[PDB]
């Protein structure tokens, strides 16, 4: 590449100006992606002759 | 979940925090929940009015309903990698 | 403007490397050594590329880089980044807990020149989390 | 249920709904979720006459004996 | 202890419940579910006498306890 | 043995009913189906707002939320 | 799938209505499934009906977050 | 059913009111089970239609699946 | 975590805008606390020696 897509590509914590340790930390360690690790929602999501039966 | 891994990824930071009731606060975040409760350190004082009466409180409990805002500032967090990391959740 | 053209040259060069050979990051460091003031613009893209070596899949140009890292860390004082120094003593004490020793070595050598560089009290991770991860790599 | 409305049904009951209102009526019939069928359903908010009618239990707030 | 647990410790015991309304509910627990949604016997109300009431859980404000509820519960 | 409020709404399927919402607002219409969260479609909707007064007359196939939904009257 | 059409206008600015008569304009940098919401460079406009007239009191915070339950209205200016 | 109807107005010109009386005249994009409503060239109108335009939005328009409250067609 | 909070006189903001000094001895994942000697902020008005207080209620915590 060149030094232009260096910096332009920058980091995680170079891009983000680091300033959380559990940005840079976690999204270096065990990261893949930033800030990725409701019942009732897929539920209603997921929402007669069946009932009377 | 994502604004979950967002405020659960900011911890020691001083950011502003208005409620419905229009109490507006400063303080040190330090611990996170599921259902994004905040606890804040140094509480700190905004404006003359929409501060509550606390004298000596150093640390608070918010639930996370009250909130209305949360006062960042852009040299804190990178909203890009927050960005792409919603395209690739949703 | 060629001093401008020899650091793009150095990281073309020291990004694009296929063989195995300890010089490059020894000599660029002795550039780096040579002019500092100088490199805050292309100090952040260098760190930039150090990061992108940091991580990746052969223990080569991982030890390069982290050796590498090493004999930058006195140059970004100069330049007084210091929380720069914080976010790499973030990744590299996360990649401390590498398989390979080859590699981890030259990791504890950015170390040692981070916490040596900057002063203990804003150093991040902090020390006291650092020297109980240590206390097995004795081993 | 934690409320046997056995004993309620067929008797006339005085609800209170959210925002409001207030319901007075026989009571027909319910279900595990306490959603009610009221006969000669009346309404004070300040007199309004209904029929038959068909109770939220999920925005009710309470449930009394009239 | 856990508030849930303490109104399932506590049965038949009299106590003032404040509700969004503004309605003074006085009355004596008989059931208690996951929701807290109560049933009172011996019931009162300020702005009317009643056997039973029923009171759903998310309507309530706070809940004036008798004094003893720690010795007769625990 | 309990008549069932989904047995009644069954009934008063495609036929006149006035539905009363959490507000001052109520709706009056032909019901022609619903589910288990009680999401109503009803044919040609009247809104009304009690203490009355008119806004507008719907015509075609309304959905309306079952959650500001109050009291369903027959009639 | 609306969110889906959210990713439109992603990192472009835009407008926002939300409970209160509250207004914000902004960059949008998030939603989600409860429609949480961060902005940048962002402005807040705030309708306040005092003493029988109209008035807004104008807060500018470049970088803020939004909580889904006051959402009201998404769209562009 | 409901989902049919949904399946049924989708692109579809719609006139969606919220708990705050504003009414919403607009193509439907799409909706989801959480009655979600994402418009196109959508025009606000204080309660009926035949109210004041207070603004215009050609862009797609997103509402709130809890502050919605019925959703009308021509 | 209110679990840092048990035992302490704490200082909590309702929704209506009322506040209150006073012991919590209780918490859940609801925000449902037992509270105990109550006390008001400004009013210093004492009103029980035991109540329970709905999560939905509180709109702010503080440690005194």
């Known amino acids: 590449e060149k030094f232009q897509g260096h910096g332009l590509k920058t980091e995680l914590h170079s891009a983000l100006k680091s300033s959380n340790l559990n940005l840079i930390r976690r999204t270096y360690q065990t990261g893949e992606n930033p800030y990725l690790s409701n019942r009732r929602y897929e539920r209603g999501l997921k929402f007669k002759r069946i009932a009377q039966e | 979940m994502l604004f979950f891994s967002f405020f659960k990824t900011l911890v020691d930071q001083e950011v502003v925090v208005e409620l419905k009731n229009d109490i507006e606060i400063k303080g040190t975040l330090q611990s996170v929940d599921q259902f994004l409760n905040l606890k804040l350190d140094n509480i700190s004082c905004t404006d003359e009015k929409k501060y509550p009466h606390l004298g000596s409180v150093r640390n608070i409990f918010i639930r996370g309903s009250t909130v209305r805002y949360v006062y960042l500032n852009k040299n804190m967090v990178d909203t890009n990698l927050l960005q792409d990391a919603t395209r690739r959740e949703v | 403007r060629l001093e401008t053209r020899l650091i793009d040259a150095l990281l073309i060069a020291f990004q694009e490397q296929t063989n195995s050979d300890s010089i490059i990051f020894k000599g660029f460091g002795a550039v780096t050594v ?75 050598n950015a170390m040692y020149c981070i916490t040596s560089v900057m002063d203990l009290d804003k150093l991040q991770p902090p020390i006291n989390q650092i020297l109980p991860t240590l206390t097995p790599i004795l081993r | 249920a934690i409320l046997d409305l056995a004993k309620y049904k067929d008797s006339k009951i005085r609800v209170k709904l959210m925002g409001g209102k207030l319901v007075i009526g026989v009571l027909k019939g319910y279900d595990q979720l306490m959603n009610l069928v009221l006969d000669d359903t009346v309404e004070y908010m300040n007199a309004r006459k209904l029929g038959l009618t068909v109770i939220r239990g999920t925005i009710l707030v309470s449930l009394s004996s009239a | 202890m856990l508030p849930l647990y303490l109104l399932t410790n506590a049965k038949g015991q009299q106590m003032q419940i404040e509700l969004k309304n503004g309605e003074i509910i006085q009355g004596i627990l008989t059931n208690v579910d996951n929701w807290m949604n109560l049933t009172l016997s011996n019931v009162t109300e300020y702005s009317v006498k009643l056997n039973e009431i029923y009171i759903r859980g998310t309507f309530i404000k706070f809940i004036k306890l008798q004094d003893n509820i720690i010795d007769k519960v625990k | 043995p309990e008549i069932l409020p989904l047995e009644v709404i069954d009934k008063t399927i495609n036929q006149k009913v006035l539905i009363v919402l959490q507000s001052n607002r109520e709706f009056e219409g032909t019901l022609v189906g619903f589910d288990d969260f009680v999401n109503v479609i009803l044919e040609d909707a009247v809104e009304w707002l009690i203490d009355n007064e008119k806004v507008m007359q719907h015509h075609g196939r309304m959905l309306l939320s079952g959650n500001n939904i109050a009291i369903l009257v027959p009639g | 799938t609306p969110l889906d059409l959210l990713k439109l206008n992603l990192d472009e600015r835009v407008y926002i209505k939300l409970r209160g008569a509250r207004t914000l304009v902004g960059t949008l940098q998030a939603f989600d499934s409860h429609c949480n919401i961060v902005l940048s460079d962002a402005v807040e406009t705030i309708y306040q009906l005092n003493n029988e007239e109209l008035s807004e009191s104008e807060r500018r915070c470049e970088m803020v977050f939004i909580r889904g339950d006051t959402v009201t209205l998404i769209s562009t200016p | 059913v409901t989902t049919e109807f949904l399946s049924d107005i989708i692109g579809k010109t719609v006139n969606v009111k919220l708990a705050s009386g504003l009414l919403y005249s607009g193509r439907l994009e799409s909706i989801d089970g959480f009655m979600n409503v994402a418009l196109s060239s959508a025009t606000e109108h204080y309660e009926s239609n035949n109210n004041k335009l207070l603004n215009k939005f050609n862009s797609d328009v997103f509402l709130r699946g809890t502050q919605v409250m019925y959703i009308s067609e021509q | 975590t209110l679990k840092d909070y048990l035992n302490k006189r704490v200082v909590i903001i309702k929704v209506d805008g009322e506040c209150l000094i006073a012991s919590l001895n209780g918490f859940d994942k609801n925000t449902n606390l037992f509270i105990t000697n109550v006390f008001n902020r400004i009013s210093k008005e004492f009103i029980c020696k035991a109540q329970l207080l709905r999560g939905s209620e509180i709109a702010l915590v503080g440690l005194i």
């Open chain 3, 34 to 108: 040579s002019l500092d003031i100088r490199m805050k613009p292309f100090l952040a893209p260098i760190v930039s590329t150090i990061l992108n070596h940091l991580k990746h899949k052969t223990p080569l140009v991982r030890q390069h880089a982290a050796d590498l890292c090493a004999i930058l860390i006195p140059v970004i004082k100069n330049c007084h980044e210091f929380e720069m120094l914080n976010k790499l003593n973030i990744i590299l004490y996360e990649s401390l807990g590498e398989v390979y020793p080859e590699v981890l070595g030259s990791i504890i």
